[PDB]
Amino acid sequence: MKKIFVVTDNRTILSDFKNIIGSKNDVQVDYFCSFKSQTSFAKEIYNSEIKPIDMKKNGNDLIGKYDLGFSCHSKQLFPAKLVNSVLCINIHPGLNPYNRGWFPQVFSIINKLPIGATIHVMDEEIDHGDIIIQEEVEVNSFENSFDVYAKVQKKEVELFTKVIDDILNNKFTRIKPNSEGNYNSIHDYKNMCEIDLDKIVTMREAIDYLRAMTHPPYKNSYFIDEHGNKVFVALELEKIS
């Protein structure tokens, strides 16, 4: 009777996991989310389908109570000794080791490194340890950050569905990542948000930039005009074929 914890701040992921994991024998599972997340998850917390936790403070208190941990779309990072003492697996919206860090799909639309989904064993470093399973996702011309994120998310759930048995059976793939690849900080993102009106680019590049920064309902890219107006920009694309 494996005992499992799952940390997420995503409703859709929370719902998919429950589905996949609740289907399984010999499994008990507690679900946690973050404190920043008290409202998004107000009906479910109150029903206690999930429970806030400060992983920074108290993550290490789950040592000894669980056999297996999962992080999927989780606002928080797991403490080292938790990760070094319990098997913790991350289900991640990018293709390690490319565009590790913040908003992988945004950076992929711009810099053309592969994007996809990875499930990997957690280590002390971010998006860094043994890969269990991962798959690339196509970026089409007509897609923005939101469409690519949504393909990635679905691939995530399909890949976890494919490997959850092996993991609960504690016999599963572990492959070293092939290079260190690259990381993008939240500051790297923030520096791209302000459009530089004088920057020289092809139309291809302006479009790829505008679509990479388009993800309803967020407001991301902007310019500051003459009169000091702050104007946010988003792009819409439609395939007519």
Ligand X SMILES: Cc1cn([C@H]2C[C@H](O)[C@@H](COP(=O)(O)OP(=O)(O)O[C@H]3O[C@H](C)[C@@H](N)[C@H](O)[C@H]3O)O2)c(=O)[nH]c1=O
Ligand Y SMILES: Cc1cn([C@H]2C[C@H](O)[C@@H](COP(=O)(O)OP(=O)(O)O)O2)c(=O)[nH]c1=O
Active site residues: 92
Total of chain residues touching a second copy, rule CB under 8 A: 36
- For ligand Y, the binding residues in 90-109 under the rule CB under 6 A are 103, 105
Pick the closer one to ligand Y by CB: 97 or 172.
Answer: 97
Pick the closer one to ligand X by CB: 86 or 220.
Answer: 220
Contact 119, 134 (CB under 8 A): yes
| CA atoms of 24 and 35, how far apart (whole Å) | 29
Residue 171 interaction partner, one of ligand Y, ligand X, a second copy, none, beta carbon < 5-8 Å per kind: none
| Residue 154 binds to ligand X (criterion: CB under 6 A) | no
> In the beta sheet, which residues pair with residue 119?
91, 133
Choice from 38, 85, 206, 218 touching ligand Y (CB under 6 A):
218
Burial of 183 (0-12, 13-18, 19+ CB in 10 A): middle
| Residue 11 binds to ligand X (criterion: CB under 6 A) | no
Q: How far is the CB of 121 from ligand Y (least distance, A)?
A: 20
Cα dist. 124→100, 121, 138 in Å? 14, 10, 30
E strand or H helix at 228: none
Distance of CA 62 to the CA centre of its chain: 22
- For ligand X, the binding residues in 196-225 under the rule CB under 6 A are 215, 218, 220
- For a second copy, the binding residues in 190-229 under the rule CB under 8 A are 195-204, 206-207, 209-210, 219, 222-223, 225-227, 229
Q: DSSP string of 140-192?
A: -TT--HHHHHHHHHHHHHHHHHHHHHHHHTT----B--SS---EE-HHHHHHH
Which residues form the interface with ligand X (CB under 6 A)? 9-10, 73, 75, 103, 105, 145, 149, 215, 218, 220
| Interface contacts to a second copy, rule CB under 8 A | 140-142, 195-204, 206-207, 209-210, 219, 222-223, 225-227, 229-241
